[PDB]
């Protein structure tokens, strides 16, 4: 009998069907004007910072329980991008959940099925974003691979990370992007990226 | 004596302190939601069960009663009250609909409400009672004491929700019989007994 | 080291890490709310205290400061600073109003805020101080260091709230004297002292 609410990062079971579907903790929705992040110490959702510019997060954004972007995650990202000395960013694995429904509040769990991801390198750190579709979603529910995902939605998501920290001076001066989008990958690779981040988590917290 | 962690919303709060005249309730779904939320029993975190399949919103505050379980005693009584055999409990905490004039947009909250009645529902030989209660000190519903004093238009809205939120168009076009059976409504005293029985089911199981 | 459960918002989080230059705050009420929420001390779950009685919304992010307690030391300083005797603490955590330009619709969150002052309020010999703070990195209020740099229209808005949210029409038509006493405002250093004392009250209580 669970007497207390479990920490969203350590509590939930990540997967029960060998990563075909995942339990996800949502931190940010399109409705938010600030960036929320799960407070590691307390397990309470916390304001990280207000949105600096004119962006909203264009999907449900959160973390995967029982994942940690660590040694194995960094090495695979480095291998997959032909890069050496790539380390993990030290946080849980980021996931973007596609849904046609309106969710206005974060601090929730949901079931989502991975279809791919965006491999991002941010100054020698792997900052992968898993892309998943909400289970039984009326629009995205039957998408099984990222190649079946509307390219306009992927561009929206890439645009968010490319601009949400870009100063006007940097955009007018055409300064190169501070994050490197190495490209997209599909379901199987995403499941591998999740598998590795889970092993990183298991070794450090279990 | 100092709670260092947040209590599980199902097991933690005290159900009643005044012999079921008012109840502490945990809210999972509001009229503002477009998905059906449900408390994850294992973790105590609010979780998306499924998106709304059709064109319904939940027309009230919907949630559960702490320290209740729809078990053996609940099933036998529901069968007794509907004169139907082999009626079992649905295995979940007891459902409650809270009437309020105010706009509540987020779930994952507690509130105090007063029961005034309930809807006896059978879903394929399972008791799926919905307790009807009024938010304490609500400016419109606060003084309502029995379901007979509740506006019938609001009760029809609530009955319509459960009669349609899982009804496919084909089943409606072919006039297939409803998959849930509304056996009728009951008043305050009967509602308090259903809560009492569901509370005993919980105590015997834990 | 693995926090398995979500921490109680009042007892769990660390109040300050920079000697009260910035504070961790737990938000109970936002401008979007139509009811008054309050952290339930026993369970640590956000709970509806009562609906808004009249035509008010809370004009800022409103909550409590973790690990604070408005006790004896808090009352004595309030009495000294207001030249009134026998002022006791109100027994709750220290209240805080957070100013932000952004729209936050959901409570039950943590955030970092920098105090700039506060409102000293006496409610029938009880200190009901309201700390005034600005959301860290807020695009508008972020650089405000003292309450004297805060627009008086915002302060009037906050004072108007506490002066009217419990004022019946009859009491206003008959111009009956206010039930709460606004003794005045204070600046950054003094607010830090009020928080320091309230933190000491809490530590001495446990
Ligand atoms: Na990351
Ligand atoms: Na049920
Ligand atoms: Na107070």
Author numbering:
A (entry chain C): 4 to 209
B (entry chain A), C (entry chain B): 3 to 208
Per the authors:
The CtPPase structure was refined to 2.25 Å resolution in space group C2221 with three molecules in the asymmetric unit. Surface-area calculations by PISA suggest a hexamer as the most likely biological assembly. Electron density modeled as an Na atom was observed in the active site of each monomer. Despite the addition of pyrophosphate to the crystallization buffer, no density was observed for pyrophosphate or phosphate ions. Additionally, the flexible active-site loop is in the open conformation indicative of an apo structure without any substrate or product in the active site of CtPPase. Comparison of the CtPPase structure with those of MtPPase and BpPPase shows that the loop adjacent to the putative allosteric binding site has moved into the pocket compared with MtPPase and BpPPase, closing off this site. Inspection of the solvent-accessible surface of CtPPase reveals a medium-sized cleft that partially occupies the fragment-binding site of BpPPase. CtPPase has a pocket in proximity to the previously identified bacterial allosteric binding sites, suggesting the possibility of developing allosteric inhibitors of CtPPase.
C. trachomatis inorganic pyrophosphatase (CtPPase) hydrolyzes inorganic pyrophosphate during metabolism. CtPPase is a small β-strand protein containing a core five-stranded oligonucleotide/oligosaccharide-binding (OB) fold. CtPPase has the prototypical family I pyrophosphatase (PPase) topology. Family 1 PPases are ubiquitous in all kingdoms of life. The overall topology of CtPPase resembles an open fist (or baseball mitt) with the substrate-binding cavity sitting in the palm, while β-strands form finger-like structures surrounding the active site.
